[PDB]
Amino acid sequence: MSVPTDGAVTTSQIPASEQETLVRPKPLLLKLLKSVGAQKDTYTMKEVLFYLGQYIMTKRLYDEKQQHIVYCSNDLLGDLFGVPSFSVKEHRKIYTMIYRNLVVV
Ligand SMILES: CC(C)(C)S(=O)(=O)C[C@H](C1CC1)N1C(=O)[C@@](C)(Cc2ncc(CC(=O)O)s2)C[C@H](c2cccc(Cl)c2)[C@H]1c1ccc(Cl)c(F)c1
């Protein structure tokens, strides 16, 4: 991954321009972002990914770093994505799950 700013994370798995897409999170996604310090209603996708990563780590949903699975069936995140678990390595899949929870500007 790459970190172009102190509040953004990017990946070579997704086109660079796509990660600059402006989005307005729906209520659940927005709540998760603000719980780790986000202070706005519109974000670029790379910012959303940063804050959601912060949420995941703060909630201890990725304690086992060598296995690349996030376990979230009992967390708000599981309800948001509609899955009990997912791989942190499958970036298109993650983007897809996030897109379902926002409006693209
Ligand atoms: C290190 C930090 C800057 C704090 S991080 O990158 O934000 C940590 C984070 C951990 C919480 C899951 N994470 C990951 O750990 C990454 C490194 C997971 C991997 N992707 C690919 C890997 C090896 C490979 O190329 O096969 S390892 C990179 C992974 C990532 C980065 C950028 C975009 C996407 Cl879609 C995913 C990132 C992450 C971000 C957000 C969500 Cl919702 C995730 F499920 C995963």
How remote is the CA of residue 4 from the centroid of ligand 1, in Å? 14
Within 10 angstroms of residue 80's Cβ, the number of other Cβ atoms is 20
Parallel, antiparallel, or unpaired for β 85-87 and 69-71? antiparallel
What experiment produced this structure? X-ray
Rounded to the nearest angstrom, the gap between the alpha carbon of residue 101 and the centroid of all alpha carbons in its chain is 11
Task: Look at residue 6 and tell me if it is in a domain.
Answer: no
Task: Look at residue 44 and tell me if it is in a domain.
Answer: yes
Note the residue count of the chain.
Answer: 105
In sequence order, what are the beta bridge partners of 44? 22
Task: Look at residue 88 and tell me if it is in a domain.
Answer: yes
Task: Look at residue 30 and tell me if it is in a domain.
Answer: yes
- 3-state SS class at 72: coil
Task: Look at residue 77 and tell me if it is in a domain.
Answer: yes
Task: Look at residue 8 and tell me if it is in a domain.
Answer: no
Dihedral sign for Cα atoms in the order 31, 34, 38, 41: positive
Question: Whose C-alpha lies nearest to ligand 1, atom 15?
Answer: 88
CATH of the domain at 55: 1.10.245.10
Tokens of 103: 């409006």
Cited resolution, angstroms: 1.8
**Residues 77/89, Cβ–Cβ less than 8 Å:** no
Ligand 1, residues at Cβ distance < 6 Å: 1, 3, 9-11, 49, 52-53, 56-57, 62, 70, 88-89, 91, 94-95
Structural domain span for residue 71: 13-104
Task: Look at residue 58 and tell me if it is in a domain.
Answer: yes
Overall domain count for the chain: 1
- 3-state SS class at 3: coil
